[PDB]
Amino acid sequence: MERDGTFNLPPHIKFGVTALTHAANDQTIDIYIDDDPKPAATFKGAGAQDQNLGTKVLDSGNGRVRVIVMANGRPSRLGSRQVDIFKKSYFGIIGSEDGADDDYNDGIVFLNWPLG
Amino acid sequence: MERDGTFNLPPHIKFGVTALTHAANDQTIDIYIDDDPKPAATFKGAGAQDQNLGTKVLDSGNGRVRVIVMANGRPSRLGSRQVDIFKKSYFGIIGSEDGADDDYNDGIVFLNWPLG
């Protein structure tokens, strides 16, 4: 039931994407919407360990959202879950590992929807 | 399975707390460890500014962590969930709302542990 950072959101809504990086591996985090081959958003690499890289606000398009984490020119292995609070506040959580590392906490990406 | 912003973490570890706001009113988010009289961390957001208030690293103490959100002179309604990625990367999620009929997204707080 962990998936690979791919989510189905309600179509045509705003959502938030927040990245928190633990490992200082200068990761690139790309967010892709539907079948567009260019990322709708990209986080540049952390400049420090346990760094909050900020929040981006995006439109879900037709609803398909994929997060890809790259470190050292390879895709980091990912685990993702969805959860919601009272079927009102929805979350996607992605843990990534750049190693070696077996722990899925080198990088974290939080998705939240809807906004407001 | 929604609780009220209280969590049991592994005793004496570091963990992260990240806070986002999306509210009309100023909000104060307090994180309390065990029975400590003062908050271990406080995030304060400005009304009408949707803000990523950053990530703080805390010590879990004896393991009890409580999140309280105040807005408009009163405690917000809270819902919380826990989730993990491959039983390795752990998360606590809190959504808060001032208004009783809203979407538990005026305040969002994420807890993550362990670090590395």
Numbering used by the authors:
A (entry chain A), B (entry chain B): 0 to 115
Paper text:
BC2L-C has an N-terminal region of 155 amino acids (the TNF-α-like lectin), a 28-aa linker region, and a 115-aa C-terminal region. Since the isolated BC2L-C-nt domain binds strongly to fucose but not to mannose and galactose, BC2L-C is therefore a novel type of lectin consisting of independent fucose and mannose-binding domains. To our knowledge, BC2L-C is the first protein identified harbouring two different lectin domains with distinct specificity, for which we refer to it to as a “superlectin”.
The C-terminal domain has sequence similarity with two-calcium bacterial lectins such as LecB/PA-IIL from P. aeruginosa (43% identity) and related ones. BC2L-C-ct bound to Man and α-methyl-mannoside (αMeMan) with a strong affinity in the micromolar range but with a stoichiometry close to 0.5, indicating that only one binding site per dimer is accessible. BC2L-C-ct is dimeric in solution with a molecular mass of 22±1 kDa whereas BC2L-C-nt is trimeric with a molecular mass of 41±1 kDa (the expected monomeric masses are 12.4 kDa and 19.3 kDa, respectively). The dimeric association displays close similarity to the lectin BC2L-A, described previously. In contrast to other crystal structures in this family, no electron density for calcium ions and monosaccharide (d-mannose) was found in the final model, presumably due to the presence of citric acid in the crystallization buffer. A sulphate ion was observed close to one of the two binding sites, establishing hydrogen bonds with Gln241, His177 and two bridging water molecules. The main difference with the mannose-binding site of RS-IIL is the presence of His177 (Asn in all other lectins). In the absence of calcium, this histidine interacts with one sulphate ion but also modifies the conformation of the C-terminus of the other chain. Since the C-terminal carboxyl group has an essential role in binding mannose and calcium in all the other similar lectins, the putative destabilizing role of His177 could account for the observed non-even stoichiometry of the dimer.
